[PDB]
């Protein structure tokens, strides 16, 4: 019983990258049948599964690799905080990817899952396009120490790429925060309040995502399972430090946004007073005119207006005089 | 929360210590070396003139103003045998008051 919770079902893809000291094989595939042998290879291998909405593929991979049904359900579940579980035959980490889009004020998320099994690393994504391109290029072009190392270093590299993209998202949010502060100080316009609320919601989501991430990485380096070599423990430690940075930044950012609300939020009763005053001003000067128009417009078959020449100019002047008196009264007593 | 090791920021080279505050205008070292019957007050701008006061028998009060100059802080910490993490904490203004007991 495996069900898929998210809303991404557009595409499915698979690709294997088996790299060694001097030879690499990068095979793009369309079905799981090719990646079945990649369990007993001596060299590090990276399996990439895109579009897990086809639950059959992940079920087959988990059955072949011995992945527990519960953690398979965790893989399928898309609304879950990042978390790490250490098992004897593999270590299972699940993390979040973010993609802020400018000119839209919206934050999009995605769930990615890494499974380290001795000589291989499985990656489960949900859409075409990711943030692990630099690792791919470094493996392809032999532009680092990645080839010389095992699959645990691959896990380190992928988490490092995730943290770097977190930093990029932080840069984007920094630009948004600066422009929003300028707008709110210059002119607290109505759309700016909605923008600030959306920014606050995005920062709350980002905090609630990042904070379990540093716990995951702490569990990664501080108490290494036998799968992670003690030689690669310091590198993981570095990544932990980086998340610290992110967290602090987010916290600072959140603080700022809170201020951006209160400075606007409490000073609203002034708007209530202005609306009260406008309504009273244009209701206290026009109800009397309507009433006098009614009484002198009242039909009676008789009136003190049988001839009464120039009476209509008299009543128009009465209207004008009353209006002028009320205007002067409010000007002098300051309801305007 | 176990063991003390230098934190690694990703925007900096691995060992560099950075000043965090927003003041660069001042720098001055005031040494005040007193005793029961004497005291020497000595205001300077050379870091190398305060080093002999580490081994002074009498009490001495060194006051370095302008920690924005990280080289002076690093030199004083290196001479007085101060741990590099304590130096990073010294230069890190954005932190709460704290106390650490070392040997």
């Amino acid at each position, epitope marked *: 019983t495996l069900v898929y919770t998210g809303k991404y079902r557009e595409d499915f893809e698979i690709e294997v990258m088996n790299y060694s000291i001097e030879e690499f094989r990068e095979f793009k595939t369309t079905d799981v049948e090719s990646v079945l042998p990649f369990r007993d290879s001596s060299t590090p291998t990276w399996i990439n599964i895109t579009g897990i909405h086809r639950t059959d593929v992940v079920q087959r991979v988990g059955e072949f690799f011995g992945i527990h049904p519960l953690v398979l359900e965790d893989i399928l579940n898309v609304h879950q905080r990042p978390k790490v579980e250490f098992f004897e035959n593999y270590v299972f980490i699940v993390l979040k990817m973010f993609t802020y889009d400018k000119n839209l004020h919206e934050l999009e998320s995605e769930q990615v899952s890494l499974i380290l099994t001795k000589n291989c690393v499985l990656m489960f994504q949900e859409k075409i396009g990711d943030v692990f391109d630099p690792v791919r290029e470094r493996i392809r072009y032999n532009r680092g120490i990645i080839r010389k190392k095992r699959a645990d270093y691959l896990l380190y590299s992928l988490i490092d790429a995730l943290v770097d993209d977190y930093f990029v998202l932080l*840069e984007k949010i920094d630009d948004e925060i600066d422009v929003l502060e300028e707008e709110v100080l210059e002119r607290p316009e109505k759309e700016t309040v909605q923008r600030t609320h959306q920014l606050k919601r995005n920062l709350v989501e980002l905090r609630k995502t990042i904070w379990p991430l540093r716990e995951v990485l702490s569990s990664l380096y501080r108490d290494v399972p036998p799968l992670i070599e003690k030689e690669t423990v310091p590198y993981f430690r570095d990544v932990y430090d980086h998340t610290i940075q992110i967290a602090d930044t987010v916290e600072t950012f959140r603080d700022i946004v809170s201020g951006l609300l209160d400075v606007y939020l409490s000073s609203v009763s002034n708007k209530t007073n202005e609306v009260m005053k406008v309504l009273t001003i244009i209701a206290t000067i026009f109800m009397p005119l309507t009433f006098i128009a009614g009484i002198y417009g009242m039909n009676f078959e008789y009136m003190p207006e049988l001839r009464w020449k120039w009476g209509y100019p008299v009543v128009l002047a009465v209207m004008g005089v009353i209006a002028v008196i009320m205007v002067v009264y409010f000007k002098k007593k300051k309801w305007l | 929360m176990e063991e003390k090791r230098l934190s690694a920021k990703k925007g900096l080279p691995p060992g560099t210590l950075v000043y965090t505050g927003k003041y660069r205008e001042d720098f001055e070292i005031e040494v005040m070396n007193y005793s029961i019957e004497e005291f020497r007050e000595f205001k300077t701008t050379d870091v190398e003139s305060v080093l002999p006061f580490r081994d002074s028998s009498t009490p001495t009060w060194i006051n370095i103003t302008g920690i924005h100059r990280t080289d002076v802080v690093q030199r004083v910490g290196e001479f007085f045998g101060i741990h590099p993490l304590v130096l990073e904490d010294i230069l890190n203004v954005h932190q709460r008051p704290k106390v650490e007991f070392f040997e």
Partner: antibody
Amino acid sequence: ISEVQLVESGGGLVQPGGSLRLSCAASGFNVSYYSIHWVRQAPGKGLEWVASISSSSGSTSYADSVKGRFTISADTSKNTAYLQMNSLRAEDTAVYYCARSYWYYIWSYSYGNAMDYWGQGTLVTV
Amino acid sequence: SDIQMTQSPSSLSASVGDRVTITCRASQSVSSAVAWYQQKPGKAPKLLIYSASSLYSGVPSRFSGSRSGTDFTLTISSLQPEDFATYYCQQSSSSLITFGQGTKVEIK
């Protein structure tokens, strides 16, 4: 009282594909505690960053234009920074400046690097 | 790839006592790691402003820097005869520092 300054030498006429070793001797401060940058200024054009060395850890950054052929290093014994230029080009003729920088803090994640002291400059013609 | 800073105008002109504004646009997002330098013709560049708002110690307070999103402005409130030089941007968000085009300030 040290009168911080950077005196730079090594700029002379060379042939394309030739080799040069620009030297930047820094007086008034220690190279180990600061970052040293090199910058070009082609005659009539603007400033162009070239290389950067942090002698404390040897971490090195190069401009993409000169990457692969230039090499910046620093010796703390002589308190000097050397820029070795190989496989030069006729478009590389410029006035080279040596600069000292200090890192400053913007946010917990973001840092900034500002050059406060500069050298005189040396002409290198190819 | 590389963050590119573009300055406007490429050159301007003014008289002593005027107010001068130079604008600088970054292709990508640099948080506040932008610095403004002044270079007189034939001399080494001089640091004026760092972090887009802070001003280096020893420069007159007439120089001011501001940022709005990605746009960065350097403003001389009351230009003085010793302020007719070429002004440059710099971004140090990444290890690959890049400089702006450079705007000359002629005298009219």
